[PDB]
């Protein structure tokens, strides 16, 4: 045993893995997502801004679970970054619906940790979920409803000019 | 034969004055375009100033190709500069479709260019192309076909609404 | 008509076309000197930089004409630019005087275009080509002819010490 | 076809969505590496540093990439992120060779990638390689050769002490 | 093999210990020119600072070269660096005709380089040789010309006066 | 007989003329000293960093006689650099013995030199290498015999760690 551990249960260590592997995944469709952006096609660059801020800021809470990992005595072990399940996303109102169900399924699997870690009677885990990551999931997924909720009101996306205009005073 | 050149083959010369003859008519047929929006009746001045800006760095383009001919011990025979294909260029997004096909054609010759150095065995001159031209065209045309997909996707020329919030968002 | 055309003659407008031609024209002419003084068999850095620096104006003056055009309610009819009536410009010296020769020219036209101003009782235009164009002109021709009468005096262009001192200590 | 495309064949495009993998990839492995260093029982914070940001740089290679298929009228597929092919990496000096190891593929997958934008005459893609690719390989390459021959040198991986002043002195 | 080897021929190699020992000689040669100018019978400073900076240069060009044989995994064999076939370099023409000479000669070889590199599939040798010598020779050759006929212009080197004025104006 | 010469013996000036060639000689060992210490299987950077700062040292030094030579009014005559007696200079102990034994050699050819100029009664230039050359000679010896007790004492070169901790510590 790491001679740091305590009070750090195997299922703790567990699904701290599958939370890192999580956050990476949610950093490539967010990767994506930014460079569909890009395209001559769609064009839309501070949508492609936006999306690479948040592939940037996702590969940072990765990165804060896996020093949680070895700060705990866990021990790191990395899986496959699935590819996300679209190439083409669509439209900024469609990219921004995937955003907003990708962090409602990172917020599912953080609330299960929680609860494995309350479960587990690791005050220290639970409340590193609680201060580093519940908060940043409500403000994330509050913010996507907001502009989901624009964007549908603006008359995106069949409206080009909806999302031309929620690209540069939402976004710039 | 002048005292500096080394393995600068005649056809190199040649193509390198026809390339200078291309620049400025770029030049020119931006200047056309510049003014257009300028008209009382068309009153885009975004427009106006970004197309005298690709105009005077046409020129740039132009003087960096003859200041190569003379480096190279080449002899500078300059053409008429042709005048534009249009004289009124209907909209915003029509001089944006003809400043993009513009370019492409800039881009061949510039391809060609880098062909024929290659085929003799110039690989000054290839580089010289590479480096200074070729990123700077391809960027070019990025950004021309970003700009056309903007346009249409926001309604553009039948809006003139889509023209006026492209030239002071995107332009401006 | 143009909403904003009041007092503009026909004549004038075509007239104003004529003279923005022949403004490239002037720009290319000195354009061609430039790169002349550049080739390595006549290195003389100071006059490729003055007739440069010429090129550059013309095209301002052009550039002026349009904007004029188009503040009348005139519509810009451009033409193709003509290539100088020389590739090699022979010395220092002849430059200059194929210059001077090249702005009267130029003052000639403005001339001609400030008789038909008053002749069609358009004070606007008349005071326009006073204001920006006359006396621009003439001191254009005293400039040129000074130089033409140092380097005349200094013994150019057979002396090309002559050419390479006046390089240094006037257009320097 | 994108409006953009021109002289991009559609091997190049495959190929560059390739290199995008293989640049992830190696960011993958490179974070692999750093927090092996920042487990308890291994505690080489410098080395941890080290190979965080090389992590870090090789997301900005692939990013880049991602850009030029975009600029280029190319269509970016991602794939699965492979993880790495260890989750213990024994050593400093090992890691440094591994590294080593993963560099020399890039470096050959990007030198394939040439040749491949060479037979297909797309000198814009040869250059970009070249210029934004090529001799940071090579840097890379001899910067970790160097790491490698001073570990051993000092007689790691035997010597703990080896690693723990070259993680200060070099590293740090 | 040396453990950063990829892709460097066994000629590359070859052909870049030549290449060092031709830029060290062409350093020995500007340092003997300088000192020429320095003595107290033939007395141009300007000349003998020109010289001397060329030579400077020229030692920095070499040693770009034993980092690049060293970045690629070659082993570096200096030779005899051979005493310039002057001692006495007659006048300021004459050296800059002799330097002129000496740059194209050094021109020839880099594009044999280049040639090689090219025929070896070597992208990273072809563009370093692009990038770092090929345009800086251009140039080179290009100014050397441009001094050699301002200097036959002037009556150089007969007219002592002429050398005098060109090493104040020119090269002071 | 140069203007200038006054009390400077012939056997003075070839003297001179030997001892340039002698501290180009040493230029060159040291850069060859230099490079063998950056290449990948060797890699000290910091003795590569010293001993390419004696290089350029010593090529100060060379000039300097070539000015003193041209003071006095004798006459440069530039030999052949003899290439170093190694291409492979073993270790940081090694090369430092080396150096060691060459500035030993440029001392003696110094001391020989300056007893010349007393035999023949020349003041000026029995204090020029008294002032300029003599004092630098024992300061070099000795902190070439300083660096080579250091090592040995820490092991050198059998131990690694101790030529990697001198490159630290006392070279960087
Ligand atoms: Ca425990
Ligand atoms: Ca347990
Ligand atoms: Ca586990
Ligand atoms: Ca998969
Ligand atoms: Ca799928
Ligand atoms: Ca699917
Ligand atoms: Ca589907
Ligand atoms: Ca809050
Ligand atoms: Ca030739
Ligand atoms: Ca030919
Ligand atoms: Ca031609
Ligand atoms: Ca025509
Ligand atoms: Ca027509
Ligand atoms: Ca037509
Ligand atoms: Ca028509
Ligand atoms: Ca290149
Ligand atoms: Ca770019
Ligand atoms: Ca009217
Ligand atoms: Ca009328
Ligand atoms: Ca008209
Ligand atoms: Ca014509
Ligand atoms: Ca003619
Ligand atoms: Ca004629
Ligand atoms: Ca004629
Ligand atoms: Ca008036
Ligand atoms: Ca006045
Ligand atoms: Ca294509
Ligand atoms: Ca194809
Ligand atoms: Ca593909
Ligand atoms: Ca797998
Ligand atoms: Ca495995
Ligand atoms: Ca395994
Ligand atoms: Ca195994
Ligand atoms: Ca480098
Ligand atoms: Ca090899
Ligand atoms: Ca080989
Ligand atoms: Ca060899
Ligand atoms: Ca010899
Ligand atoms: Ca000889
Ligand atoms: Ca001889
Ligand atoms: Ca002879
Ligand atoms: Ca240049
Ligand atoms: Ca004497
Ligand atoms: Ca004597
Ligand atoms: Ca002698
Ligand atoms: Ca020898
Ligand atoms: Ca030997
Ligand atoms: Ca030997
Ligand atoms: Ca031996
Ligand atoms: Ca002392
Ligand atoms: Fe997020
Ligand atoms: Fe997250
Ligand atoms: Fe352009
Ligand atoms: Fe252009
Ligand atoms: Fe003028
Ligand atoms: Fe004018
Ligand atoms: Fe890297
Ligand atoms: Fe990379
Ligand atoms: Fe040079
Ligand atoms: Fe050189
Ligand atoms: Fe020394
Ligand atoms: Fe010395």
Same mark, same amino acid.
Request: proline share 2%.
């Given at each position: 045993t790491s001679q740091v551990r305590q009070n750090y249960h195997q299922d703790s260590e567990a699904a701290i893995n599958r939370q890192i592997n999580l956050e990476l995944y949610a950093s490539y469709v967010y990767l994506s997502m930014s460079y569909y952006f890009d395209r001559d096609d769609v064009a839309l660059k501070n949508f492609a801004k936006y999306f690479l801020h948040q592939s940037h800021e996702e590969r940072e809470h990765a990165e804060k679970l896996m020093k949680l990992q070895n700060q705990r005595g866990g021990r790191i072990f990395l899986q496959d970054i699935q590819k996300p399940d #679209? !190439? !083409?996303? #669509?439209s900024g109102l469609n990219a921004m619906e995937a955003a907003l169900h990708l962090e409602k399924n990172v917020n599912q699997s953080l609330l299960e940790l929680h609860k494995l870690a309350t479960d587990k009677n690791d005050p220290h885990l639970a409340d590193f979920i609680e201060t580093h990551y519940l908060n940043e999931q409500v403000k994330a997924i509050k913010e996507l409803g907001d502009h989901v909720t624009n964007l549908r009101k603006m008359g995106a996306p069949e409206s080009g000019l909806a999302e031309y205009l929620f690209d540069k005073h939402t976004l710039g």
């Amino acid at each position: 045993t790491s001679q740091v551990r305590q009070n750090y249960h195997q299922d703790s260590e567990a699904a701290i893995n599958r939370q890192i592997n999580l956050e990476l995944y949610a950093s490539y469709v967010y990767l994506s997502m930014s460079y569909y952006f890009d395209r001559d096609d769609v064009a839309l660059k501070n949508f492609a801004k936006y999306f690479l801020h948040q592939s940037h800021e996702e590969r940072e809470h990765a990165e804060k679970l896996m020093k949680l990992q070895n700060q705990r005595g866990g021990r790191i072990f990395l899986q496959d970054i699935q590819k996300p399940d #679209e !190439d !083409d996303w #669509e439209s900024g109102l469609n990219a921004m619906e995937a955003a907003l169900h990708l962090e409602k399924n990172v917020n599912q699997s953080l609330l299960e940790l929680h609860k494995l870690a309350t479960d587990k009677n690791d005050p220290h885990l639970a409340d590193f979920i609680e201060t580093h990551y519940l908060n940043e999931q409500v403000k994330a997924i509050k913010e996507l409803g907001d502009h989901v909720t624009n964007l549908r009101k603006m008359g995106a996306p069949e409206s080009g000019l909806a999302e031309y205009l929620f690209d540069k005073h939402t976004l710039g």
